[PDB]
Amino acid sequence: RVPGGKRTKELGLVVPIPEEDGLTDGQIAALFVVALVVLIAAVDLARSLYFGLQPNKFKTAKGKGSITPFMKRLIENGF
């Protein structure tokens, strides 16, 4: 390095550099696989946020909707 700091030059502070890179190609690939999973989930989340709630679902969607018993208890308790 060509240090430009007065304190660095005075005290001889150094930026030690390893001989070998910390992570290997396989480790970087695994991290990238996890990042890809994150990206897919994030795209799905962005789509959901963009489209918001769909109150029409009760007209065509399968099932009859459900409220968890704890959610019902919270509703009964109130705010």
């Binding site: 430009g4 992570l23 991290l31 709630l53």
Partner: protein, 659 residues
């Protein structure tokens, strides 16, 4: 809507996240669900940021080598892969045959080292786990969207027999808008139990990692020493663990206060507020909740900014000359932003959330404040005027006398009150020791007194502007009917004498300049006293010392970074010093020159484009017809340029001077 101008993009981007303003966001249920999903996405972003920092430390950096010799070594942030750099010869950031690297000024190395990270494998495992946590956060967002959709479907499919079925309209967002249960679980589990868990982590991982000899975890790991261990120059890890244990126990106890899951136990926040001094307010108001959270976060961010520097909690953090200053300045700026944010959202609450009673009725705290807002503002103005007049006048007296060469003629008021408080604190600490604290007590002189009064002036004026905006947001003598208009509107016309900057958003715009000033004053004070304690003590009583011994003197390395002689590792800092100066100057344009001139100029440019031979036959100008930025849009853009330049031109200076 095909009929649109180029102002469409700016109008949209100014309210992209203003979910309350969204079209077809019918109800509070939609609002709350959207906000919850946005919160989940935000947590995912934070976790990805943590994972990226950890990954780059593990891969591009030298954590293993640094932990061997932390004092002289400098951590690496990440590699530089920039094609624009010179290829003929090695760059200042390389070892003449090595990848270019950047030093890290975030203290994350000290954080990991005192947390108990010994090998890059542990950092890699953390990178992986935080990425998994981001996945979990996004999936939880999706899960909750689905659950709330399933409740709407249910409510649609099932109906109570009596006509009161419409009452269920209010309880669909109970899970997101309930306050008692949220308070209980946040303060008990998210705070107290989190502290207890971190105590467990310390005892299991951090203490054995720091201690060379093995010793079984026991109460010996909990201690009440104080001050900094000499070897690491940081707070004893054993004390941090007890600290967090004590706070966790206290907050776990406090987390049983409200009735959360059953009505048999706990008290109600409505009931406390009703029976307390503050009559009651719209606790349901999301803007009010945001304001309170932002105020608390601002005070906590200021507290951490001061205390991380005062009492070093991280191994060898004090030895890092640059990282200390960077951390202090970073968290001071974040705290100032959060404070002004709380004020702005209180103003928005008043604009569009508070349900004011009839004029003569005075039952709520907000109405009582609005009764004498005039007195509040007048007294705040008086305090600001006094502070400014006398601070500036004493500084100018000292300036003139020093310029004439007579330091003995300077007015030097000894800080007797602060010195007495400091002496009492020192007496208590000395008694405790008889039964070291570095940077918790500082010499304190007349220069400190003057700088403290200047910072008080800054705070008082910022609060003056913000309070005036908040209390005139609903109405004003100049604009009585300000409730009908939006939070931020251009003006009210040149009539009534002229109505520039008449909105509560315009008061925020104005208070932003002050925040930046008062934060600049605070940062300059800290940096000057840090760089040159003796020179600051002797010479900080007149402003020429600040202008010469601090700025002009310490500006040399940065500007000399790259020149005709060559370049060094601060060349990037020197280029960002100038880029940010240019950004500030550009912001001046949007702040000074207003919209009519630019609209006419845009009209002329559009005429030229429509008269050009080839371009006219393709581009009509009908779609996204170019227009000059609106008044509020330009105010905001100029403010953004000003803020970016002001904030970003400092870190280069502090790094250059402290490195």
């Amino acid at each position: 809507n095909g009929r649109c101008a180029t102002s469409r993009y700016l109008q949209v981007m100014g309210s992209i996240h203003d979910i309350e303003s969204y079209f077809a966001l019918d109800n509070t249920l939609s609002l709350n669900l959207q906000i919850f999903t946005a919160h989940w996405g935000h947590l995912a972003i934070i976790l990805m940021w943590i994972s990226g920092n950890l990954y780059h430390i593990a891969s591009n950096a030298n954590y293993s080598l640094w932990i061997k010799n932390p004092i002289p070594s400098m951590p690496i942030a990440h590699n530089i892969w920039d094609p624009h750099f010179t290829s003929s010869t090695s760059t200042p950031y390389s070892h003449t045959t090595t990848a270019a690297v950047l030093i890290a000024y975030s203290g994350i190395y000290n954080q990991l080292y005192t947390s108990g990270f010994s090998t890059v494998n542990q950092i890699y495992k953390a990178t992986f786990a935080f990425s998994c946590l981001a996945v979990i956060s996004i999936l939880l967002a999706k899960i909750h969207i689905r659950t709330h959709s399933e409740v709407l479907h249910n409510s649609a499919t099932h109906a109570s027999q009596i006509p009161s079925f419409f009452q269920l309209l209010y309880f669909l967002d109970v899970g997101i808008s309930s306050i008692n249960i949220r308070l209980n679980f946040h303060t008990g589990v998210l705070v107290g139990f989190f502290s207890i868990a971190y105590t467990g982590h310390l005892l299991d991982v951090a203490i054995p990692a720091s201690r060379a000899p093995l010793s079984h975890t026991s109460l010996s790991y909990l201690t009440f020493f104080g001050g900094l261990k000499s070897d690491t120059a940081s707070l004893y890890l054993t004390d941090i663990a007890h600290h967090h244990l004590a706070i966790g126990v206290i907050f776990v106890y406090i987390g049983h206060l409200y009735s959360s899951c059953s009505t048999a136990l706990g008290t109600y926040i409505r009931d406390m507020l009703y029976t307390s001094a503050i009559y009651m307010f719209q606790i349901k108001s999301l803007h009010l909740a945001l304001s309170l959270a932002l105020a608390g976060c601002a005070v906590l961010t200021s507290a951490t900014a001061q205390h991380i520097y005062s009492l070093t909690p991280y191994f060898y953090l004090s030895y890092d000359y640059v990282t200390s200053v960077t951390l202090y300045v970073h968290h001071s700026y974040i705290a100032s932003f959060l404070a002004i944010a709380s004020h702005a959202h209180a103003a928005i609450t008043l604009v569009r959330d508070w349900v004011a009673p009839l004029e003569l009725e005075s039952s709520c705290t907000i109405a009582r404040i609005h009764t004498h807002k005039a007195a509040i503002i007048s007294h705040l103005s008086w305090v600001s005027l006094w502070l400014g007049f006398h601070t500036l006048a004493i500084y100018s007296h000292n300036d003139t006398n020093m310029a004439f060469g007579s330091p003995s003629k300077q007015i030097l008021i000894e800080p007797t009150n602060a010195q007495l408080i400091q002496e009492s604190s020192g007496k208590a600490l000395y008694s405790f020791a008889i039964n070291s604290f570095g940077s918790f007590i500082y010499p304190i002189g007349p220069g400190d007194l003057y700088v403290h009064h200047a910072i008080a002036l800054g705070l008082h004026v910022t609060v003056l502007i913000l309070l005036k905006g908040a209390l005139e947001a609903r109405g004003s003598k100049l604009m009585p009917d300000k409730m009908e208009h939006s939070f931020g509107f251009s003006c009210d016309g040149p009539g009534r004498g002229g109505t520039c900057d008449i909105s509560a958003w315009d008061c925020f715009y104005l208070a932003m300049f002050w925040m930046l000033n008062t934060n600049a004053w605070i940062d300059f004070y800290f940096h000057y006293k840090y760089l040159a304690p003796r020179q600051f003590s002797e010479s900080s009583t007149y402003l020429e010392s600040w202008f010469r011994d601090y700025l002009w003197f310490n500006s040399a390395p940065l500007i000399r970074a790259y020149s005709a002689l060559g370049t060094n590792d601060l060349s990037v800092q020197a280029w960002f010093f100038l880029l940010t100066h240019l950004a500030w100057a550009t912001g001046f344009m949007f702040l000074i020159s207003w919209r009519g001139y630019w609209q006419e100029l845009i009209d002329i440019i559009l005429y030229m484009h429509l008269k050009t031979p080839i371009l006219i036959d393709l581009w009509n100008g009908g779609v996204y017809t170019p227009l000059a930025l609106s008044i509020v849009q330009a105010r905001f853009i100029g403010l953004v340029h000003f803020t970016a330049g002001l904030i970003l031109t400092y870190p280069p200076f502090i790094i250059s001077t402290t490195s």
